[PDB]
């Protein structure tokens, strides 16, 4: 279920946002993975239980969590799924997890692992998706050093480092917004249906056609009862995309 560092940071950020974190800090070096958490954190009694939620407690794993009504906080260290033992630590409320040579005890997993730069870009794109999805949550990313953005309303302008025009349309059940700058030497077309990101290449070529061919486009869509690779009732959505590209 893991297979990659980007799935490690996916699970740890996923639990972090499930914890009502408003601040998520991800550090990778390509080896450790670290995710530091603003959230409610784990009860001390459950700290050893949850390690045997995260597995990927193989490999070489260390966690510490303070629950928000507990004054103490607790750290467990395991290696390759076997516990190297626990201690109490003063920490702020939240969780830190450290990963630190994934797949050391299992080669032919570790040789499946891609190039340094490739996994770095996978982690960076995932943090981009979590950021564009969650404007009200801080995110930080470290590789050498940072990538950072705070609570915002248009966060599209911070992550893509450009100024966007905002477009809007609502018809029937469908409400969809767009953020578009014009140039940036490159097409980048992002589409979010509900808050879930969609990589569908048909929709990105459609966005290439109705918007500009080298353009930034970030499209947030809301339709209530749909399916999610995803299925919807396509014609009225796509003609609504044709609409608001006429501003």
From Swiss-Prot:
Which superkingdom does the taxonomy of this entry point to?
Bacteria
CC per GO annotation: mismatch repair complex
User: What keywords appear on the UniProt entry?
Assistant: DNA damage, DNA repair
A GO MF annotation of the entry reads: mismatched DNA binding
As given in the record, the signal peptide range reads none
Is DNA damage among this UniProt entry's keywords? Answer: yes
Q: Which Gene Ontology BP annotations are present? A: mismatch repair
State the protein's purpose: This protein is involved in the repair of mismatches in DNA. It is required for dam-dependent methyl-directed DNA mismatch repair. May act as a 'molecular matchmaker', a protein that promotes the formation of a stable complex between two or more DNA-binding proteins in an ATP-dependent manner without itself being part of a final effector complex.
Q: Which family does it belong to?
A: Belongs to the DNA mismatch repair MutL/HexB family.
Query: What name is this protein filed under?
Result: DNA mismatch repair protein MutL
Upper classification of the source organism reads: Bacteria, Pseudomonadati, Aquificota, Aquificia, Aquificales
